[PDB]
């Protein structure tokens with residue numbers, strides 16, 4: 001069943017707290033409407049990312065807070081998590097912050113990292129909650145389009161085996177899993193559709209060699225990207241790609257999932273999708289200037305308009321930088337100085353207040369104020 005129906009995805013307190021800076025900024029500008037819209041954003045659920053082992057320490061406090069909230073509110077709390085730590089992570093990038101490396105026991109270390117997450121998701125408090133978990137952004141798409149890259153060649157089996165173990169390890173009645181499936185501009189090209197469906201099924205099949213009746217709910221798309229759910233002005237760079245918005249990505253990928261027997265249910269990130277015409281190339285991803293908050297999290301079919309979409313969600317938390325634009329930074333990524341990037345920007349994950357100011361102003365539909 002669609003786990004989002006009737007459920008209240010969890011507001012991430014640590015994220016809502018960061019927005020106090022944005023509220024203070026608008027108040028200091030004499031801008032009560034945008035201050036109030038930012039207050040609305042504080043109440044919008046986002047995903048909590050587990051992108052390293054240290055972050056596992058945040059999970060039990062998050063769960064305890066979630067249970068307290070469930071008791072107080074009478075809601076059916078749905079905790080949204082991202083697992084993002086495969087060994088030799090981000091194999092096609094020039095650099096990665098992933099902490100595990102295949103040549104330093106990374107496969108076993110990844111299993112133990114998953115085991116630590118499982119432990120946290122196995123407490124009596126965890127049992128009271130429901131979870132929606134996105135598995136490993138920037139992973140399997142590389143086996144479709146980046147197999148000319150030495151690091152991807154060396155990591156392909158490990159990505160499939162890693163994700164298989166994660167799936168097999170999180171088979172509980174209160175957990176729904178969505179495997180990351182990139183975005184239309186990556187895997188939506190005609191040549192990529194069938195191989196993508198095949199690798200998702202292959203990975204699920206591997207999971208079932210570990211835990212016999214293992215399942216997933218489906219796929220997560222547009223994670224940390226900006227693609228509109230429904231475009232109002234198709235971009236020139238989408239020429240010859242039928243997945244020119246994410247609703248069309250769902251429509252075009254679905255038949256291939258069905259053909260291979262992989263579940264064709266999707267959650268779609270729209271956290272930074274409010275404004276179009278902000279990029280000159282589809283491949284631009286880092287702190288794209290003038291991005292706006294998009295469609296708010298919802299299961300409403302009047303908006304979603306697809307039996308294959310479980311929900312629109314906000315996976316990447318807007319305001320957390322994609323990377324630094326400082327040319328002299330140790331982790332400088334040239335993508336973060338693209339012609340479309342917002343500069344200066346702080347290190348990946350650090351608060352980028354100027355960017356959130358713009359996410360509020362450029363939100364579509366406009367944010368309703370909470371006065």
Ligand SMILES: [Mg+2]
Pocket residue numbers: 096097098099
């Ligand atoms: Mg490192």
